[PDB]
Amino acid sequence: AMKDLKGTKTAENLKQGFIGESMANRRYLYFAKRADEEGYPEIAGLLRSIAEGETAHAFGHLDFIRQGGLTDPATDKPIGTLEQMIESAIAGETYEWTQMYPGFAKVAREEGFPEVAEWFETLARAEKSHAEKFQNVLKQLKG
Amino acid sequence: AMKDLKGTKTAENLKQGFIGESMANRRYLYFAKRADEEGYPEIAGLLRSIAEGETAHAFGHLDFIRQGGLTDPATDKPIGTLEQMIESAIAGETYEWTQMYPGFAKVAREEGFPEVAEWFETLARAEKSHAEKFQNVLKQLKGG
Ligand SMILES: [Cl-]
Ligand SMILES: [Cl-]
Ligand SMILES: [Fe+3]
Ligand SMILES: [Fe+3]
Ligand SMILES: [Fe+3]
Ligand SMILES: [Fe+3]
Ligand SMILES: [O-]
Ligand SMILES: [O-]
């Protein structure tokens, strides 16, 4: 491992860097599909390659987070070992299906956006499925 | 009106949902590499397949964001047209190389983490390159 990063500004900067790099990869792949449709294959290919750069950046942020004794940016749980990684996935998916997406759906219906609410409700069910599958992984790793 | 979401709580929830889904895909692909090394191909395959689910979720959030007249979660810029998408990329990468990563690197050096600082400095130069590449894309879309 490396030097303990707990309590530093650098620890928070690695977290914020990870968030930005994660968004960037998703955004650029989404933009590339628009270039695909419109017939700009060289632009689309460049966007996809830049997206690979943002993957490398996000993974590198996680390397320093992990080696510096810090927790998962998304869940505040340790991600040193594979079992811990799966436990972090479980915690995040559980938050999403028990709290986040059901709340998003309720608000969307209150604000008069039932189609968006249906989407959030679909996702709530999907994250519960994800959580159950990750829990099956953990039981098998621990057995 | 689902086509005008501006100023609503649903607008903020779509943004936060996109952020979480984006992180989830990155996290699960990263975790899959550990399963790969240790010889857990079924676990790695599950992580990768669930990661595809989180991609679909993130992209769907962006669909509703764009259809509702909302802005890019990362830059607060419109992303309706391809040119707007590229202009959002330029703005974000420019912020990253002129301000964010240089500031992160300075803090890392002052806090005694030179390896992290060097990483942030590498990324600052990388985002400058990315910004220039997106700038070229825009020139090409405009006729260049
Ligand atoms: Cl092209
Ligand atoms: Cl396996
Ligand atoms: Fe980057
Ligand atoms: Fe999820
Ligand atoms: Fe999801
Ligand atoms: Fe970037
Ligand atoms: O980035
Ligand atoms: O998710």
Numbering used by the authors:
A (entry chain B): 0 to 142
B (entry chain A): 0 to 143
What do the authors of the reporting publication say about this deposited model?
One such protein is sulerythrin (SulE), a ruberythrin-like protein isolated from the thermophilic archeon Sulfolobus tokodaii. SulE lacks the characteristic C-terminal, rubredoxin-like FeS4 domain of ruberythrins and contains a binuclear metal centre that coordinates iron and zinc when isolated from S. tokodaii. In contrast to other members of the ruberythrin family, a crystal structure of native SulE shows that it forms homodimers through domain swapping, with each monomer contributing two α-helices to give two four-helix bundles that each harbour a solvent-accessible, single dimetal site. The exact function of SulE is unknown, but it is presumed to be involved in reactions against oxidative stress.
In order to test the effect of the total absorbed dose on SpReAD analysis, data collection at higher flux values was repeated on the same crystal used at 5% beamline flux, choosing distinct, non-overlapping positions at least 50 µm apart. Using RADDOSE-3D, the total average diffraction-weighted dose was calculated to be 0.26 MGy for 5% flux, 0.52 MGy for 10% flux and 2.70 MGy for 100% flux. While there was no difference in the oxidation states of all iron ions between 5% and 10% flux, at 100% flux a clear difference was visible for Fe-2 and Fe-4 at position 2, where the edge position was coincident with Fe-1 and Fe-3, suggesting that iron ions at this position are reduced.
